[PDB]
Design a protein around this nucleic acid. Structure first.
Ligand code: ATP
Ligand code: ATP
Ligand code: K
Ligand code: K
Ligand code: K
Ligand code: MG
Ligand code: MG
Ligand code: MG
Ligand code: MG
Ligand code: MG
Ligand code: MG
Ligand code: MG
Ligand code: MG
Ligand code: MG
Ligand code: MG
Ligand code: MG
Ligand code: MG
Ligand code: MG
Ligand code: MG
Ligand code: MG
Ligand code: MG
Ligand code: ZN
Lengths: 47, 465
RNA sequence: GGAGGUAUG
RNA sequence: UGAUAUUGAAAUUCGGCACAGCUUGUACAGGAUAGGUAGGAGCCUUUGAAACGUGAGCGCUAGCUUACGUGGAGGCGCUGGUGGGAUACUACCCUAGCUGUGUUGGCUUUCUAACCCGCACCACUUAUCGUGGUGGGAGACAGUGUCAGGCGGGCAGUUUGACUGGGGCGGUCGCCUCCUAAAAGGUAACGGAGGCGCUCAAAGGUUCCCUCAGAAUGGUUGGAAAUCAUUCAUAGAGUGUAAAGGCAUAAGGGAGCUUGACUGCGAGACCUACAAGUCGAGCAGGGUCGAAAGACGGACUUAGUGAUCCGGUGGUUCCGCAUG
RNA sequence: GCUGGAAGGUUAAGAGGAGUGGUUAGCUUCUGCGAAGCUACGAAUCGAAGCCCCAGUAAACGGCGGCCGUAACUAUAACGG
RNA sequence: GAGGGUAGCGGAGAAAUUCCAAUCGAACCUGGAGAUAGCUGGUUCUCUCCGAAAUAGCUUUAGGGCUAGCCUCAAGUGAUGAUUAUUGGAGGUAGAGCACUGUUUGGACGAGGGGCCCCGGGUUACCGAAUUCAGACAAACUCCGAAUGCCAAUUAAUU
RNA sequence: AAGCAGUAAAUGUGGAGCCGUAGCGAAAGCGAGUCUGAAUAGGGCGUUUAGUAUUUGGUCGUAGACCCGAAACCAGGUGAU
RNA sequence: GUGGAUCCUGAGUACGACGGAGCACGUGAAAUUCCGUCGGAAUCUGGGAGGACCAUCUCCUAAGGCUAAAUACUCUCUAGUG
RNA sequence: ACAUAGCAUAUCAGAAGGCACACCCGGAGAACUGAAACAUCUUAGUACCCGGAGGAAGAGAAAGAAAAUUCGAUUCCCUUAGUAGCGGCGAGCGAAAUGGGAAGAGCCCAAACCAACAAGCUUGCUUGUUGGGGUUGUAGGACACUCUAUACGGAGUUACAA
RNA sequence: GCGGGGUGGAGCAGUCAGGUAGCUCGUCGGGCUCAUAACCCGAAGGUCGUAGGUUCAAAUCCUGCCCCCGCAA
């Protein structure tokens, strides 16, 4: 259970912080979140 | 030159930190023997350095290019083990790497090709990292040694003997410093207790003090201040105790201990027999038609160079009866030269329990003796390292209801401190075993009916020498 | 062939 | 203690670089000591093949190397087969050692001319100081300077909590929930009882559906307590986790789809010394679910935290000591 | 603690100078590349004592145990574990 | 006894923290220097108007301080203040009660165990319980629930 | 203001400079509006004018700052009658 | 005053590394300036500076000396003042 | 052993030493204090000690301020401004330029080169002293060339010689 | 009241960090021996004080209780 920075897969801007189990959700987690530059809801992976 | 750099690398692998690496550096004319137990991070690290596997965190930059002869190679059993590995070594040293990354290059080889390989690598002028567990191999080859303990890469100038020596002295130094700390703490705590006793005595009246002396009541503050003085001293000692440099033990893992649930041995006059087994595939006489027989309690062994047909001999045992004579008592446990387990079957538990009928607590306890913990037995079997795949195969084949074991290249990826448990288990097994291995020094304990295949013919004698 | 020194009851 | 000036001259020796030469190259299998690539079917041979002999280098003890004398015609290869790779032969190169020419330093001693002698003798001189001179010793060390490391209460400057039925010990220090708390709120004590320093990619959001625990009875492995069937049962279950307040018109339990655990804000309010903390409709953007209405800026609520300075990482229609 | 040993390891200043970065003479195809020079950083490696390490030293600092059972009175225990 | 020597980051010490010009836990004089003092003491004439506080929070903070709270003066807003009457409302106190939580008495049955006797059956006994009749306890129980106090009001009166 | 002239005067002279008249924004910068922001939405801070110079009094800061009062610290010197 | 053929225009100096100080400026991005140690330039198509450094552009010409005035104070003398 | 200390004899308005409890330059250099403790920091380059000089001292005629139509030694007052910055970014320390004024003043050396003399006696032309010459940035000077002019002038014992 | 402990018959490990309960002596049977001791071969003997939870898994972690040792009182 640890801190997590997201980031958009077409600009590279973080835009979000959250937290996850590194055990239960171990992989590079990815979710769709608004991106304030494209003004579109975009897929954001972790970095 | 530099040839490579790695900076502020962290590889968590699960919740557990596998690797915490800083200023990883491997320069020209560099010859590194990397070592650690099973599950330590070796193959993973080398894959990172070869860039095949980018980490969760950190930077790698390779200046000269590399070649990564692989482990757990995904390539089908068209050839023999050993031959495949020879092919990959040849690929590498054809490609002119300038950095060779080897994770277990000594797998399924014969001592002769091993001798060529160490000769090639002494004559070699490039660089390399190499992972073997072969003590004399590394003692000949390497100049630097690395140790993966809990992601901490310790570096050691010299030979595997020097690693043993240095780590021995460091273990010893650490234990001694710990004993010193415990002893000192004990002493100061005892001091505290005595001084507190006196402090409590300081205020209470003496014994047999009569009326005038008891009615005296002016001296209360004197005695209260004396008590405060002694208690201030206990505070000083407690402060010193805190100012002591704390020092820990290492959380040392318990040792490897393998098990065989039970053999109700019967030891009867013969377990296997066969006559004139035509050994071939097509156009090749792999070995001559010959007989054989195996008797109650035999620690049968096999010794053969590459591409001989030991594996196929064992396959003839395990399947088909051309010139073979088996009985219904023998129940073979087949450990392969390949995986034999289900890769993505969703748990070690499931893949093991498939072939055994025993309790969950016993099986997880055996796995825990093998060092697969509570949250680790649900790991997939593809994710795993080689040595621990080998261990799980062995456990599945143990808890199989069996009495004769049939082991094509055990002891292969395993570590120096499970091969000894395995050595002792096979030494002490009341039943029969048949197996292949290139380690005569492992065989010294084990064998009772030694075999030798060569020159398309066979021989079989008894006892070691 | 003989002489001298050199565990419990 | 080490580097560096003071600080010089000679040489052995050991190393690294270049160049020339003598060469040297064995895993197993295979005819046997298979260095790399390329060319390669001819190479050698009275300008002396095989074989005999010495001498001698290497060596993995198999054997090759070649100075030679006797000898006088075959010896070797593609082919064959083996093996990852083919053998003769040659062009160029590589490994390892040796040798040499030159560089390149280093250790090691040797020397004397610097430097040193609270060593002797002579003179200034009458002087145990000093200066100079000669002779011996030591010698480019020491001693001295700068730079760096280690030791160093020998010495110094300083720190070494508060609360509290005196102080001290014991306990506590921040946050959350009950009671004391006197039916708003607030309210103290070393008054009484308990928890926190997390957790959950679903235990969130949404849409659908469901309603528990416990008792009696019937029934295999039997408290029939496991699971089942019925009836009773309005809450005694459950609500991630303390207690209280609440929830069964569900805030509880399952299932399907998803990511609103969004961006920019925010009228008006609560609490409040300050800094902070809390609630918040509603607007806009761009959306998940639902047929739609509509719900959605985390979780039934309340704890689950830490100022500034400082430094690290990323981004930027921000400055950038004349100009760029 | 002191004394000696010195293999090995860790360890500075200094020596050394891989690599990264800034500028720009010229090239450019889109604004990217970018010699030398000057610059800011700078790795590997070399690198003493000390420390780790081995031994000795107690008229050096200093330190010197527990539990259980047991023999012709019972108590104790020369004795045993 | 004389003549002399050793000087305070020091000297002398048959060693006591002892002596170093009537005081030595580091002499005396001068200066820095009016050290610093959150500590105590003191602070000088008259009258007039108003007139507290000894509380909260934070504080290496507790006999100090800062901010608020309570005071005074001035400028401004301008009836927003006080009290009562009436209405309404939130809230769970004293009381009371046992409807849950726990406690508890005496009974009626019991649900079946236990000690003991011979598979079953007994018992001058615990009764874990369940149920029920009656009586009782509670700051951290409440099916219930005051007076007061509080918050306001398009209301009236007095101030 | 300093400076110059003047009786140690007032006063004359000197307009470098200072406050103010326009703010907002970290800044580039825009301008009665700007910063935030996608926004012409909403919000913050401002506009929809009076400041200035000298001076009485009050208070604050820096200087010992209402007076007295340590134990003590440092530097230089005096002392073995 | 003209000319630009060659020569000259301050050396162990500037500068740098280290350690320190002093520059309003605490090593900080630290320019400029002195000291100690060590090493160690250039030469008018030069050298320095314009707050790290580079280029361009501009301003001077280090490492050699002298220079009143306006400014400071008052033991003291005279004449006076509050 | 030459000669070198050393020793002896004569001359110096030669020095010394005192001070004005001031002013100035340089060496060397604290602590109480403040920071509500303290160690960096502050106190403070203060006090004390020491050397030296003057009636003033020091600094000073750009290897400079700056960034426009640029200014032309230094020093001192004002203001820039408690700004910019420095800072356990704490306590606190804290400018300068610009601009307005007082006063204003600029000069000499070294080097090249010429000449005399001396050592090498290259007898070639290197080294040294003396005298000349010459001194700076919109580069200057030596070198060569052209005008002058020998104090007509010009400047001086406050620099530029005394 | 505070602090440590309770593992076959005795004494000790193992608890920190959960993974099939171990060491020496002893006990029992059998051997050797004229018999006993020693010695040789086998075997028993441990709900880890107890009762509850957590866990797939408890000597091990948490709870509660009964004793044992010191201190006190
Ligand atoms: N994706 C994964 N998820 C979880 N555990 C993983 C994953 N990959 C590897 N592991 C575990 O982490 C370790 C991986 O290390 P790695 O494969 O490098 O081991 P290794 O040193 O090569 O081992 P071996 O000697 O057995 O070959 C092993 O314990 C493996 O069980
Ligand atoms: N499908 C196949 N086609 C052709 N050849 C095959 C095939 N399978 C096996 N072989 C050959 O048969 C022989 C089998 O070798 P095997 O694996 O039995 O030997 P081994 O004794 O295990 O040796 P090692 O594992 O060390 O190579 C090898 O020559 C392999 O190349
Ligand atoms: K006196
Ligand atoms: K600086
Ligand atoms: K300039
Ligand atoms: Mg591996
Ligand atoms: Mg095989
Ligand atoms: Mg001390
Ligand atoms: Mg102090
Ligand atoms: Mg106190
Ligand atoms: Mg008390
Ligand atoms: Mg009292
Ligand atoms: Mg209340
Ligand atoms: Mg710039
Ligand atoms: Mg006296
Ligand atoms: Mg003072
Ligand atoms: Mg009154
Ligand atoms: Mg009541
Ligand atoms: Mg009540
Ligand atoms: Mg210098
Ligand atoms: Mg202070
Ligand atoms: Zn984006």
């Amino acid at each position: 259970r640890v801190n997590v920075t997201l980031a958009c897969t077409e600009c590279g801007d973080r835009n979000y912080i959250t937290t996850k189990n590194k055990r239960n959700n171990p992989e590079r987690v990815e979710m769709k979140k608004f991106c304030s530059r494209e003004n579109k809801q975009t897929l954001h992976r972790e970095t | 030159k530099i040839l490579l750099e790695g900076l502020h690398i962290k590889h968590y692998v699960q919740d557990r930190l596998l690797l915490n690496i800083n200023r990883l550096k491997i320069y020209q004319n560099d010859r590194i023997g990397l070592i650690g137990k099973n599950g330590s991070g070796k193959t993973t690290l080398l894959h990172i350095l070869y860039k095949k596997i980018v980490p969760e965190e950190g930077i790698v930059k390779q200046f000269s290019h590399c070649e990564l002869i692989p482990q757990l190679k995904l390539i089908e059993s068209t050839k023999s083990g050993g031959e495949v590995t020879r092919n990959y070594i040849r690929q590498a040293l054809d490609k002119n790497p300038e950095l060779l990354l080897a994770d277990q290059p000594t797998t399924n080889l014969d001592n002769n090709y091993i001798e060529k390989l160490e000769q090639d690598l002494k004559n070699w002028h490039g660089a390399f990292i190499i992972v073997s567990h072969d003590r004399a191999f590394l003692d000949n080859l390497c100049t630097t040694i690395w140790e993966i303990d809990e992601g901490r890469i310790t570096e050691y100038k010299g030979n595997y003997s020097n690693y043993v020596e240095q780590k021995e002295l460091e273990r010893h130094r650490e234990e001694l410093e710990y004993e010193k700390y415990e002893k000192e703490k004990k002493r100061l705590e005892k001091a505290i207790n005595i001084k507190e006793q006196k402090a409590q005595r300081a205020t209470k009246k003496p014994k047999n003090l009569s009326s005038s002396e008891g009615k005296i009541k002016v001296t209360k503050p004197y005695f209260a201040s004396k008590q405060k003085k002694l208690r201030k001293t206990v505070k000083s000692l407690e402060t010193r105790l805190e100012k002591l440099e704390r020092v820990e033990k290492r959380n040392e893992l318990p040792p490897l201990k393998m098990d065989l649930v039970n053999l109700e041995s019967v030891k009867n006059r013969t377990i296997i027999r066969g006559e004139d087994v035509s050994g071939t595939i097509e156009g090749r006489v792999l070995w001559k038609a010959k007989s054989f027989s195996i008797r109650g309690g035999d620690k049968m062994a096999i010794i053969g160079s590459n591409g001989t047909g030991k594996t196929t001999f064992i396959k003839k045992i395990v399947h088909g009866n051309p010139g073979i004579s088996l009985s219904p008592s023998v129940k073979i446990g087949y450990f392969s030269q390949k995986i034999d387990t289900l890769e993505l079957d969703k748990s070690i538990l499931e893949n093991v329990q498939s072939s055994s009928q025993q309790n969950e607590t016993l099986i997880r306890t055996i796995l825990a003796r093998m060092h697969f913990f509570r949250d680790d037995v649900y790991k997939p079997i593809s994710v795993l390292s080689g040595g621990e795949r080998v261990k799980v195969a062995l456990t599945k084949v143990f808890l199989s209801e069996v009495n004769t074991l049939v082991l094509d290249q055990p002891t292969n990826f395993l570590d120096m401190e499970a091969i000894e448990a395995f050595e002792s288990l096979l030494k002490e097994y009341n039943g029969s075993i048949i197996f292949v291995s290139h380690d005569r020094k492992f065989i010294e304990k084990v064998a009772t009916r030694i075999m030798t295949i060569d020159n398309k013919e066979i021989k079989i004698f008894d006892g070691t020498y």
